[PDB]
Nucleic acid binder design. Structure first.
Lengths: 237, 49, 49, 87, 49
DNA sequence: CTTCGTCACGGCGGCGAAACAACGAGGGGCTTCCACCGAAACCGCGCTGCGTTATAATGGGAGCTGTCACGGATGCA
DNA sequence: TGCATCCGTGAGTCGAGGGTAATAAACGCAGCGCGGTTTCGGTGGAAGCCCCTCGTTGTTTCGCCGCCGTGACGAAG
C-alpha cells in the first residue's frame, strides 16, 4: 500500500549545531513508532572519537591534585572528558600535552598527530601556576555510543593510567514530541518534532542522515524475509 | 476558520469562587466530550467521574 | 458500562425557540432549549469585573 | 411563543427584499416601478393595469405586454439562478 | 434498562407520598439508619441524591 | 558519396464576407357584444338568549392536621 | 410589664421532565345573521378594424486562404 499522502521534513536551525526537524503528516500513532527508535539510534549509532584513558606525570595515587596546576584533578579530568576529537584508526592513538610556565593551558596546546584531529583548540584546561610544568598523556580511540570507563587490569603496567568514559557518538542529545496535525479532516494524522543537538566536530543534520542510513539498512536486513511483501509505500517526490 | 482564536466560556454548577468560570480559547475536537486542560480542574473542582 | 453516555448528555444551541411569557429560551435537551445562567454565576461574573 | 421571529427569516427577508432591488434595478426602471405597485410591494395596494395608465400614460394592454416582458426575460435562468436559493 | 433495575425497583421501601413526609419536612434524623433496619431494610442501598 | 523530393517560410494578392445606412408592413391604437361577476336583495332558520316549571322537600362534608430555626409581632395578665 | 405564643419567613447551582374529576331538564319564543335563494350588469375577455416600427441593398475593407516562389533539410540511390 501507499502512504496515500506524502509527508515532508523541514530542518530548522537554532544554533550552528542544534536543529529541529518537523515531519508531517505521519499516519496515526507513527510519531512514537519512529521517534524513540531514532533518538536511541542517534545516541547509539553515529561513529566518533573520544578520550578513553589518561595518565599524567607526578600522580600515582594522588587522585586529588597535582602541583604546577592549581585546580583539582577531577576538574581537568572532566574538562578533557568533554573533548571533541576525530580519529581514522581503531588502534589506540596517543596524544601528549606539555606546557611549561604559569598561565592557562588550553585544548589548543595539545599536539595531536595527523589522523587525530581536534575541533576545540580554544577550550581552556588548566590554571598552570608556580612555573608549572606538566605532561598529560591521552589514550584515545573511536567507536559509537556511550562506553563507560574501563579500568586498568594491568594495574602495575599502567599504574599512573586513568580509565575514563567515552562519548563516542558525536551527538549530545535528541528529543522528540508528537502532535495532532489534522486529526479531524485527515484521520488522526500526527506531526513529529525532533530536536537534535551535537558536538561542533559534526553537524546536526548529517548525523541524522547517517541515522536514516543505518536504520534503513537495519530494516532492509528484515525486509529480506519476503522481498515481495505488500507493506506500505510513500509515493513521489 | 471561524474558531480561529475566538474565546469561549466554561462553567460548572456550582460556581462558588470567582474562578468557577473560565474563558478558554477553544480548539476543535473530534467526539462529543469537552477536553479540559488537566490543571484548571482544581478551581473548577471538577473530577471526571 | 453505565447508562450515562456522552451520546446522550450533550446539548448545543445557537438559537432555538423561546419561552411563552418571557422571550427567554426554554430548558431541555429534547427541545432545542437553551442553557441556564444563574445568579450564582452572575456573582463570579461580576467578580471578574 | 408562536409569535417568535425565527431571525433567520428576518435577515433572509431583508436579503429577499434587497435581492429584489438588485434584480429589479438590473431590469428596466419602468418595469421595476410597474411591479412595485402592481404587486403593491412598496405600498399597501397592488394595482390593476388601468390605474397604471395614469401613472405611466399607456394603455392597460401595454402593461399586459410588459408583465410578460418582465416575467419571460426574468424566466431566463440568469435571474432565476440567483433567486432560487431564496426558498 | 437491566434486569436489576426491573427487580430492585420493586422491593423498594419509600418514605415519601400521601401519608409520607416531604423532603423539606423530612428532617435529618429520619434519614438515619435506625437500628430497627437490621434485616428489614437494606442499610446501604439508598439513593445518593 | 552523390544527387533528387519535400516541407516549411515568407510574402502576394485577389476574393470575400461582415459591418454600416437610404427605409415600409407586423405591432400599437380603435369600436362592439353579451356569458358573466358582482352586486344587491330576498329570503328562512341553527344558534343564543331567555322565560318557566306549583308536595314537601329548611343548616357545608372535609381534613388531617407535624420540620428547623428564629425574630418578632401579637393576645394575656 | 412581661410573657407566652403564633407566626412569617428561608432552607442549592443545577440535568431526569407533557394531562389527573362531576349532576333530576326540558318547552317555547325572538333575534338572529349565515346561508339557501333570485335580479342584470357592464366590464370584463373575445371579435373585428386602422398608423407607425423593423428588414433589402450598396458599399468598405481587413482578412485570409489559394498561389507563388525560396530555400533547405531532407530522401533516395
Amino acid at each position: 500500500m501507499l502512504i496515500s499522502q506524502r509527508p515532508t521534513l523541514s530542518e530548522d536551525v537554532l544554533t550552528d549545531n542544534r536543529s529541529q526537524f518537523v515531519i508531517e503528516p505521519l499516519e496515526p500513532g507513527f510519531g512514537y513508532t519512529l521517534g524513540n527508535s531514532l533518538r536511541r539510534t542517534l545516541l547509539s549509532s553515529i561513529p566518533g572519537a573520544a578520550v578513553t584513558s589518561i595518565r599524567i606525570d607526578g600522580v600515582l595515587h594522588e587522585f586529588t591534585t597535582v602541583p604546577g596546576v592549581k585546580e583539582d584533578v577531577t576538574e581537568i579530568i572532566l574538562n578533557l572528558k568533554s573533548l571533541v576529537v576525530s580519529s581514522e584508526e581503531d588502534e589506540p592513538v596517543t596524544m601528549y600535552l606539555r606546557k611549561q610556565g604559569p598561565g592557562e593551558v588550553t585544548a589548543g596546546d595539545i599536539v595531536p598527530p595527523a589522523g587525530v584531529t581536534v575541533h576545540n583548540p580554544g577550550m581552556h584546561i588548566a590554571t598552570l601556576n608556580d612555573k608549572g610544568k606538566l605532561e598529560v598523556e591521552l589514550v584515545v580511540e573511536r567507536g559509537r555510543g556511550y562506553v563507560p570507563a574501563v579500568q586498568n587490569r594491568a594495574s602495575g603496567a599502567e599504574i599512573g593510567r586513568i580509565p575514563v568514559d567515552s562519548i563516542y557518538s558525536p551527538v549530545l542529545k535528541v528529543t522528540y514530541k508528537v502532535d495532532a496535525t489534522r486529526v479531524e479532516q485527515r484521520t488522526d494524522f500526527d506531526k513529529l518534532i525532533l530536536d537534535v543537538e551535537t558536538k561542533n566536530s559534526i553537524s546536526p543534520r548529517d548525523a541524522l542522515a547517517s541515522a536514516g542510513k543505518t536504520l534503513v539498512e537495519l530494516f532492509g536486513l528484515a525486509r529480506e524475509l519476503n522481498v515481495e511483501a505488500e507493506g506500505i509505500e510513500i509515493g513521489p517526490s | 476558520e471561524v474558531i480561529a482564536e475566538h474565546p469561549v466560556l466554561l462553567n460548572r454548577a456550582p460556581t462558588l469562587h470567582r474562578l468557577g468560570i473560565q474563558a478558554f480559547e477553544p480548539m476543535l475536537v473530534e467526539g462529543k466530550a469537552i477536553q479540559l486542560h488537566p490543571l484548571v480542574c482544581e478551581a473548577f473542582n471538577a473530577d471526571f467521574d | 458500562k453505565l447508562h450515562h453516555l456522552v451520546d446522550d448528555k450533550i446539548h448545543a444551541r445557537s438559537t432555538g425557540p423561546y419561552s411563552m411569557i418571557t422571550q427567554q429560551p426554554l430548558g431541555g435537551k429534547a427541545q432545542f432549549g437553551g442553557q441556564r445562567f444563574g445568579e450564582m454565576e452572575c456573582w463570579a461574573m461580576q467578580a471578574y469585573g | 411563543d408562536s409569535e417568535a421571529v425565527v431571525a433567520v427569516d428576518a435577515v433572509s427577508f431583508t436579503l429577499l427584499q434587497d435581492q429584489l432591488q438588485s434584480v429589479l434595478d438590473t431590469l428596466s426602471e419602468r418595469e421595476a416601478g410597474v411591479v412595485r405597485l402592481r404587486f403593491g410591494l412598496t405600498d399597501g395596494q397592488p394595482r390593476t393595469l388601468d390605474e397604471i395608465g395614469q401613472v405611466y400614460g399607456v394603455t392597460r394592454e401595454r402593461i399586459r405586454q410588459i408583465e410578460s416582458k418582465t416575467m419571460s426575460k426574468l424566466r431566463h435562468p440568469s435571474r432565476s439562478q440567483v433567486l432560487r436559493d431564496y426558498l | 434498562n437491566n434486569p436489576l433495575s426491573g427487580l430492585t425497583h420493586k422491593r423498594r421501601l419509600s418514605a415519601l407520598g400521601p401519608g409520607g413526609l416531604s423532603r423539606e419536612r423530612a428532617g435529618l434524623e429520619v434519614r438515619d439508619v435506625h437500628p430497627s433496619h437490621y434485616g428489614r431494610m437494606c442499610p446501604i442501598e439508598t439513593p445518593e441524591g
